Amino acid sequence: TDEYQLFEELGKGAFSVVRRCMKIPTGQEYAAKIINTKKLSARDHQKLEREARICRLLKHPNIVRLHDSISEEGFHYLVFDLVTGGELFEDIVAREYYSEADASHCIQQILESVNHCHLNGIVHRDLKPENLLLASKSKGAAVKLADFGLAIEVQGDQQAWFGFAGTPGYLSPEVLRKDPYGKPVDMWACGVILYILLVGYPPFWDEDQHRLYQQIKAGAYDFPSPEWDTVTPEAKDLINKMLTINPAKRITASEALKHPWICQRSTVASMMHRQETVDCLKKFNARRKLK
Numbered sequence: 688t689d690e691y692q693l694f695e696e697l698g699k700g701a702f703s704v705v706r707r708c709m710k711i712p713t714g715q716e717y718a719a720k721i722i723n724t725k726k727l728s729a730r731d732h733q734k735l736e737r738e739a740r741i742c743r744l745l746k747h748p749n750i751v752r753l754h755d756s757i758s759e760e761g762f763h764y765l766v767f768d769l770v771t772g773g774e775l776f777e778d779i780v781a782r783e784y785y786s787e788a789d790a791s792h793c794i795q796q797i798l799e800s801v802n803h804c805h806l807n808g809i810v811h812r813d814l815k816p817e818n819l820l821l822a823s824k825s826k827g828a829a830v831k832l833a834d835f836g837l838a839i840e841v842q843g844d845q846q847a848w849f850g851f852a853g854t855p856g857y858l859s860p861e862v863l864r865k866d867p868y869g870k871p872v873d874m875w876a877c878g879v880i881l882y883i884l885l886v887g888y889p890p891f892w893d894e895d896q897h898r899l900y901q902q903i904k905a906g907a908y909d910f911p912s913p914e915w916d917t918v919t920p921e922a923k924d925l926i927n928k929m930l931t932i933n934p935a936k937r938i939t940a941s942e943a944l945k946h947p948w949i950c951q952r953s954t955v956a957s958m959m960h961r962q963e964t965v966d967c968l969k970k971f972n973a974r975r976k977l978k
């Protein structure tokens with residue numbers, strides 16, 4: 688800990704904070720989650736070691752890397768390799784060309800990280816734009832799935848009621864019905880994200896959170912004209928299969944990586960520029976920054 692220098696705030700939590708830090712003797716930059724271990728519940732104490740254990744298990748080019756776990760007097764540090772490219776969604780709105788192919792490229796990377804989570808018995812439970820970063824400012828920076836603070840460990844394909852966790856706009860139907868759930872919830876979130884990547888606004892939305900949940904449980908999304916008239920049928924097909932209410936028939940991550948819009952991207956995904964999507968995303972990002 689004394690080996691690290693702390694700088695600005697990168698995030699905030701109930702009993703934690705995320706700060707940019709640097710390894711003093713070598714100058715390597717990291718993102719450290721600083722948890723005040725003092726006056727911490729037993730429940731909260733198990734969640735902390737569960738996050739450390741989960742992050743330690745995940746080594747993948749599309750997942751953030753845990754560098755160190757540190758226990759000090761009254762504080763605990765979760766040190767991750769720092770990614771400097773910012774949010775994927777903020778990078779897209781800065782582009783001059785953005786098409787289905789780019790969205791397919793992004794979702795493919797997200798699907799690799801989700802598939803690598805599920806192959807290791809880990810369900811993220813909170814897939815959302817804030818947790819989708821870009822490795823660098825380099826042209827071809829890799830997408831990085833971040834923040835496993837809500838992730839859970841599961842055995843095989845055994846569902847269970849693991850609790851009401853996540854973000855309202857991305858919650859699956861089965862979590863809202865308080866049914867047992869598992870890996871498919873991440874794939875419902877990927878469906879929401881993919882929808883937003885194509886048109887720039889969420890498939891489910893309402894001022895009243897109670898109406899939102901009725902929309903989600905009913906699968907009350909559609910592909911309205913005119914913006915969806917130019918989206919390929921294969922792109923709507925992949926979304927459909929992710930936003931499938933029945934969790935058993937919902938497409939898995941390994942199946943989605945073999946969908947023609949993903950694996951045959953160069954000949955299936957449209958290359959047309961979608962400026963209206965860029966414009967909508969700019970508004971979507973602005974609304975997020977308020978809350």
Ligand SMILES: CN(C)C(=O)c1cc2cnc(Nc3ccc(N4CCNCC4)cn3)nc2n1C1CCCC1
Pocket residue numbers: 697698705718719720751765767768769770771773774817818820833834835836
């Ligand atoms: C710490 N934990 C548990 C992680 O999973 C984790 C590993 C991370 C590695 N690199 C970053 N770099 C980074 C991320 C966001 C921003 N901001 C740019 C300006 N506005 C919005 C955000 C700036 N830099 N962040 C990481 N995170 C967290 C992701 C959310 C915050 C910290």
